[PDB]
Amino acid sequence: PSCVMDDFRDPQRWKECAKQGKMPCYFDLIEENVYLTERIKRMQCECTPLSKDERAQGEIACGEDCLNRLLMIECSSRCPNGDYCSNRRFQRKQHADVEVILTEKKGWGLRAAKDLPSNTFVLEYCGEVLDHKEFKARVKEYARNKNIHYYFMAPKNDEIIDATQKGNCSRFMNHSCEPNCETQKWTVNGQLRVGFFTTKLVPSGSELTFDYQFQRYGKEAQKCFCGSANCRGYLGGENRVSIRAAGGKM
């Protein structure tokens, strides 16, 4: 079982494919984070604009030496390189070509549909941004529902991104003690956005994974099936954390 990302656009066909076990269970697809209604501008880079001949010669706009990129800030529409700017990947949704696949023991997963060079933007981790009090409410709800999969991302020093009910296909990225992706915290238009990026050349067909650095507050630990010869055993490690520490409250 395998399905490309444009399969998730028709919710009726998606829902019916899911009833047949060929697609994962329905969730609300979103293109950008949804906040729970909480929600002079010039952060230009210093790249000298590419001439229209340089464009024609293959030069990159806002490449590796772009001051915005080097600080993990995306350029805006006003970037000196304009339409050429290659540092608007989150905003333009310039994702890697990936598929959602069914794994043996971890539920559904993400695999590369073509070779991805190292340091390649995979997908943004989108979800609902929760404050600490809605986080606790969802902890209770997901526990009482007896969910198996959890989808809480805790950006360091920041609110939880919950992709359990709304998100994109990045919510399928499984954990590995020996991963081939990393998260990267980027700012787009003053807002934090978290992206998955490759850390090595991922060959076509390989599962994409990252290190959850998972913080378990559940009583019962989850054995890790990443299969790495240096596998840490359980998703959460040896010790359980409180609910407030898991949610990043000191």
Partner: peptide, 11 residues
């Protein structure tokens, strides 16, 4: 406590 559950962390 909840039976299962946890939070992923970037770092």
């Amino acid at each position: 406590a909840p039976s299962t559950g946890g939070v992923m962390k970037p770092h």
